[PDB]
Amino acid sequence: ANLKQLKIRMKAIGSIKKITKAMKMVAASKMKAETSRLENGRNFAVGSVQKMLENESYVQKKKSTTAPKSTLLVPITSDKGLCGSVNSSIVREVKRLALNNRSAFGLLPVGEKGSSGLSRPFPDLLKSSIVNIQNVNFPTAAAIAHQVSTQGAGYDQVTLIYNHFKNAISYVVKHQELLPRAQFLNLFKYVTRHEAVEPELEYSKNYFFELYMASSVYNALLNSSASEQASRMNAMENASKNAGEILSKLTLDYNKARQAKITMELIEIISGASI
Amino acid sequence: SRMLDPITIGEEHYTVARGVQKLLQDYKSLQDIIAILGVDDLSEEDKLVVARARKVQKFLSQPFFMSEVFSGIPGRFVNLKQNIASFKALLEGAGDEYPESCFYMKGDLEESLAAGRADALKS
Amino acid sequence: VSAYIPTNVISITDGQIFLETELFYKGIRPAINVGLSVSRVGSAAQIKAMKKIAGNLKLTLATYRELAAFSQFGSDLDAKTQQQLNTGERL
């Protein structure tokens, strides 16, 4: 069946499996660094402001306990494609929570795929996004926390959607809930159990707000970046597996076509030699 | 079929025919990459084509009265008006929310919705 | 087209019009594969008003066929590529 065409398509699958197999190696190599960086940066000042605020008894007595009617969603996704199904899951969950009720979320995306995938379903809702992150570091995560702080004044709550890197092969979506600056300052000014005199409360309230926001942001990026390489490696493994199976199947058909070709040509030669 | 032309049959029937052919044709041009890797990394507009193509493919199947012993389910007789209307609503995106299983071995589009709606009620 | 009879006829005739079954079902009727179709006479037969417009038409369609793959890639699109991609779709 036109052996020349089959052998060409087999070559294409071979290259795909080759490059697919190579990207898996790089996916594991980069995952190693992310895991090393995550284990070193994880749980960095996480829950600190939350713990002390809980330790503040007088604050809880006067804590304004209300349900935020309008919140801000900042989903975290990878920018490079072919990273796995983690991006599809994040954009899927935010889509569900957003499609249900509209005009109650700002939906400031993070990552090319997260923003691109949500551009068409939610037009006029997402206005800006962050992409092309050179490296993950606390100074950068703070700049991201600042941008969300500026856009969070209009909303009563802020939450981040990202993958949680619990295992090298298990990444579960996890979402943190962070209150905006306005609600945090009014709640923080009641702090009385923990003295703040070295910097005055008017300054300490704003500074500790950044720590409260950047810590969550910086932690989420690591979990998502680690899940990217983890999900990417698995995707290449499954892709390379499927590439090999299909390539082997065509090899059988190529041999079958080879036998038929010899049979066809051989019968022609015998037909001419008969007469 | 030589009978398939806009002048012989109603123009609507011709449009619905090309809509299904174009849908499955576009989906056929992507089955290659779908085999190597899943559709998750696939583009959104392309995923919709793939998703909707599956629904139509499953809906094409229907039980026959003579084949009732083989499958064990009663056959279905689909009228021409129901045939055109069934696929017309499906191409528009009527039963896209329901799972592709409810369209398996169904006579009319409304029948699949009843099964698909019940599947959403139990869960 | 690698068969015996088609190959011979192609070498005998001047030009050949390739019909694609994929283009036919995708709504492209007449399903003509301009990438392979060719004519020896070329613009020598077209009229003056046609040669001028026919020249640029081929170039525009040539670029569109290339960017067809990038559409699947997506995730970004330059201003010019968006125009060339759309422009080719009109043709």
């Binding site: - | 290659d32 990459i33 | 670029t63 793959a69 699947q72 890639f73």
Partner: peptide, 27 residues
């Protein structure tokens, strides 16, 4: 079933887009 054409188009497509911007900088 033609994956070689898919890779070929992807090659020319991305290269054209990539070098199209490089042409702007070069000019």
């Amino acid at each position: 079933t033609r994956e070689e054409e898919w890779l070929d188009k992807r090659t020319k497509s991305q290269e054209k887009v990539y070098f199209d911007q490089e042409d702007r900088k070069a000019m």
